[PDB]
Amino acid sequence: SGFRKMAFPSGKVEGCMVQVTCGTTTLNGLWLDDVVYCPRHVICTSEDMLNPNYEDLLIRKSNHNFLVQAGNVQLRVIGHSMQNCVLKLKVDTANPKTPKYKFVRIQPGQTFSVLACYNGSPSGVYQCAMRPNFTIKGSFLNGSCGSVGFNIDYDCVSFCYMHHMELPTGVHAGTDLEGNFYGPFVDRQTAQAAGTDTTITVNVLAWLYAAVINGDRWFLNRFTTTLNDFNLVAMKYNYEPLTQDHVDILGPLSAQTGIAVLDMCASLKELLQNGMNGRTILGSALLEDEFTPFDVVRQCS
């Protein structure tokens, strides 16, 4: 037993991290087959970043303006193009460490592992959720840009995130690997704030199941409720609505414990109103919302 914020093993992704330099800017790229993926803002000077014309800045650029380094080996760039906010550098050599992979776009509430890198060198792994306001509460210092987020499904790496920038509040904004932003953000130096964030209700519920599975049962009660009743409470506390689909995804956990989602919703309703009466759940004084139902089943079963 025990319950921890757990990342996927990072090794299949560590094998894909390179350093990309354009002028004075250095950051991380993802090397898969014969292409290196990195944020297009690597082509910007600090002057450029206030109002960049990426079209113009890039036609002015050529292959030789890009220094790709895989540890102690220079990769030769033989092509360059832009997909949305991502720069694709074609290289002369396929990554012999390319895993089975696809590019996937995640939904808010979904979790993924982040390999934090500095100078194309993997430094840390941590599990994140994509927030309802499309930011992530990561840990990123300068040179972190181009760090990626991923899931593993058997042998297949699903790449879902690339880090572009930190917002004024300390939270982070990035794209999928096709360079589409998550959330209403642009890759320019400008005034950008995260929306007011919400709590991922289905994830809180999943985590209450994890707590019960690990013997932390105090908050259970004899009561049940309804989606409509609960959701008027949720909306009140800046919780996402619980849909019937959320209820069905918790299904397995509802079985293994005998606590039906609206049964557990009544526990949660009461924690939102009355609080934790001091106590903790899985060594947290907060209602944790960065474990999905899948995460709880995966780690506990």
Q: Which position among 16, 22, 38, 41 bears the catalytic label?
A: 41
Rounded Cα distance, 142 and 53, in Å = 23
**Which window, 11-19, 81-89, 223-231, 243-251, contacts Na ion (CB under 5 A)?**
223-231
Q: Which position among 85, 128, 145, 160 bears the catalytic label?
A: 145
Annotated catalytic, 172?
Answer: no
Residue 106 interface partner, choices Cl ion, ligand RB7, a second copy, none, CB cut-off 5-8 Å depending on type: Cl ion
Minimum distance, C-beta of residue 284 to a second copy, in the bound complex (Å): 7
Minimum distance, C-beta of residue 109 to a second copy, in the bound complex (Å): 17
Query: In the chain, what is the straight-line distance between the N-terminal and C-terminal CA atoms, in Å?
Result: 10
**How many Cβ atoms from other residues are within 10 Å of residue 226's Cβ?**
11
SS3 294: helix
Determine which residue in the list 19, 110, 111, 292 makes contact with Cl ion, applying CB under 5 A.
110
Helix (H) or strand (E) segment spanning residue 76:
none
Nearer to Cl ion, 68 or 106 (CB): 106
Residue 187 interface partner, choices ligand RB7, a second copy, Na ion, none, CB cut-off 5-8 Å depending on type: ligand RB7
CB 31 within 8 A of CB 18: yes
Q: Which parts of 262-291 interact with Na ion (CB under 5 A)?
A: 263, 266
Minimum distance, C-beta of residue 223 to Na ion, in the bound complex (Å): 5
Minimum distance, C-beta of residue 171 to a second copy, in the bound complex (Å): 7
Q: By CB under 5 A, tell whether 133 contacts Cl ion.
A: no
CB 154 within 8 A of CB 177: no
Rounded Cα distance, 250 and 248, in Å = 5
Taken in order 82, 78, 114, 169, the sign of the CA dihedral is negative
Residue 139 interface partner, choices a second copy, Cl ion, Na ion, none, CB cut-off 5-8 Å depending on type: a second copy
Rounded Cα distance, 277 and 279, in Å = 6
The closest of 298, 296, 261, 267 to 152, measured between CA atoms, is 298
Rounded Cα distance, 57 and 42, in Å = 11
Residue 221 interface partner, choices Cl ion, a second copy, Na ion, none, CB cut-off 5-8 Å depending on type: Na ion
Minimum distance, C-beta of residue 229 to a second copy, in the bound complex (Å): 26
Q: By CB under 5 A, tell whether 221 contacts Na ion.
A: yes
Chain residues that interact with Cl ion, rule: CB under 5 A:
106-107, 110
Q: What are the catalytic residues?
A: 41, 145
